[PDB]
Amino acid sequence: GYSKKVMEHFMNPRNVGVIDDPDGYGKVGNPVCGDLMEIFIKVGDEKIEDIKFRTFGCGAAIATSSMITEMARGKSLEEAMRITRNDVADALDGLPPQKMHCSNLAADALHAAINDYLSKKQKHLEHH
Amino acid sequence: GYSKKVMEHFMNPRNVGVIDDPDGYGKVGNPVCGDLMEIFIKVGDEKIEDIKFRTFGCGAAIATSSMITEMARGKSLEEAMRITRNDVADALDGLPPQKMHCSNLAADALHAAINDYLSKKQKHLEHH
Ligand code: FES
Ligand code: FES
């Protein structure tokens, strides 16, 4: 019992892949299934200049990540940080409640990748 | 304007502290404020035998972590994994919408600590 939008993003996920040498990297595992979600970001002019995700997880996780990465592309870091699964709640309505977990991977990995980038920036400016 | 339950868990948070040499460790940062949530778990008989959190974050993050860790204490790993912020949505009703992010740290760190423990266990399988 899924949604048309989820079906579209599972069948034709956007932004699948890897970035070599990314500016930010975030990885989160779902321990139930043991699936791992990785987000890679490139940052230019404090905007998401490129984003990719890689997972072997389930339909729900893949479709959520496709929607989240699409939303994030070309936004400022601060805007991207404010994205949560809540921003695509309507597309996810009526999913089995155990797919809640799967749907949280995307946003949590994105937030991790952004924090990764930001902490690198902080370290660079240790003494300045 | 906050909830009475949130006020109680912010003023008297349960399970604050650290576990030295924990069975599972999970850390997640909120990049907006730069606050970091750490969860420590001890695992005995595939149950949460001890849990502690450590953060310097905001009231919302602290109260959520107090509620989440209290829910997790003494549950099986599998039950604990199924906990999300959704399980305390009622207590969190009407929080400023930016505290959604803060409220997700707790569950995400707990899930990270459980994955940490499980992957350590996975090491044994390499034995052949
Ligand atoms: S089971 Fe691996 S993501 Fe749904
Ligand atoms: S301000 Fe850092 S946790 Fe909400």
C-alpha to C-alpha distance for A82 and A94, rounded to whole angstroms: 24
- Among chain B, residues having any CB pair with chain A shorter than 8 Å are 28-32, 34, 77-78, 81-82, 84, 86, 98, 100-101, 104, 108, 111-112, 114-115, 118-119
Question: Could you tell me which residues come within 8 angstroms of residue B106 by beta carbon, excluding any fewer than 6 positions away?
Answer: B37, B39, B53, B61, B64, B65, B67, B68, B69, B85
Structural method: X-ray
Q: CB B84 to CB A98 under 8 A?
A: no
Choosing from A2, A25, A33, A121, which is the catalytic residue? A33
Query: What residue ranges do the domains of chain A occupy?
Result: 22-128
> B64 with B103: CB under 8 angstroms?
yes
Residue the block writes with tokens 């200049």: A49
* Annotation marks residue B33 as catalytic: yes
What is the length of chain A?
128
**Radius of gyration of the CA atoms of chain A, in A:** 15
C-alpha to C-alpha distance for B92 and B60, rounded to whole angstroms: 9
- Looking at the complex, report in whole angstroms how far the Cα of residue A98 sits from the nearest Cα belonging to chain B: 8
Query: Which tokens hold the place of A49?
Result: 């200049």
C-alpha to C-alpha distance for B9 and B55, rounded to whole angstroms: 14
